[PDB]
């Protein structure tokens, strides 16, 4: 399925997108991570349900110096995205 996750907290400017991309690639997932102008990070990830749960473990922690306060999740059908990009 597709996970669309919205990450709140001290998350921009701390390498969060690169962190997500590394773990998504480790977990066989495709999609993207993008900074939002309201201060959040949006993560779209497509792939197996358990891999999405493993990614969520990382999304809730973030890199060194991130302070992730919450991760809102919503699920939808995969669209066939390839690769994992940062925007
Ligand atoms: Na980054
Ligand atoms: Na961005």
- The answer to whether 35 is a known catalytic residue is yes
Cα(73) to ligand 1 centroid in Å equals 20
Which resolution, in Å, applies to this structure? 1.0
Instruction: Give one word for 54, left, alpha or beta, with left for phi > 0 and alpha for psi -120 to 50.
Output: alpha
Nearest ligand to the CA of 13 is 1
Cα(31) to ligand 2 centroid in Å equals 14
DSSP letters along 47-61, please?
S-HHHHHHHHHHHTT
d(CA 15, CA 8): 14
Q: Experimental technique used?
A: X-ray
- Tokens 């919205």 locate to 6
- The answer to whether 17 is a known catalytic residue is yes
Give the start-to-end residue ranges of the domains of the chain: 1-87
DSSP state of 24: H
Q: Which residue(s) pair with 78 in the sheet?
A: none
At 46, is the secondary structure helix, strand, or coil?
strand
Identify the sign of the CA torsion 72, 78, 79, 81.
positive
- Which are the contacts of 3, defined by CB distance < 8 A and separation ≥ 6? 31, 43, 44, 45, 46, 52, 55, 56, 73, 74, 75
Distances from the Cα of 75 to the Cα of 18, 48, 52, 80, angstroms: 22, 12, 10, 14
d(CA 3, CA 12): 20
Nearest ligand to the CA of 11 is 1
d(CA 49, CA 36): 25
């Amino acid at each position: 399925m597709r996970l669309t996750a919205l990450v709140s907290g001290h998350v921009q400017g701390v390498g969060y997108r690169l962190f997500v991309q590394r773990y998504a690639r480790d977990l066989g997932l495709h999609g993207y991570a993008e900074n939002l102008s309201d201060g959040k990070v949006e993560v779209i990830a497509e792939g197996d349900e358990d891999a999405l749960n493993r990614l969520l473990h990382w999304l809730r922690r973030g890199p060194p110096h991130a302070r992730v306060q919450a991760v809102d999740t919503q699920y939808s059908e995969e669209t066939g995205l390839r690769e994992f990009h940062i925007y």
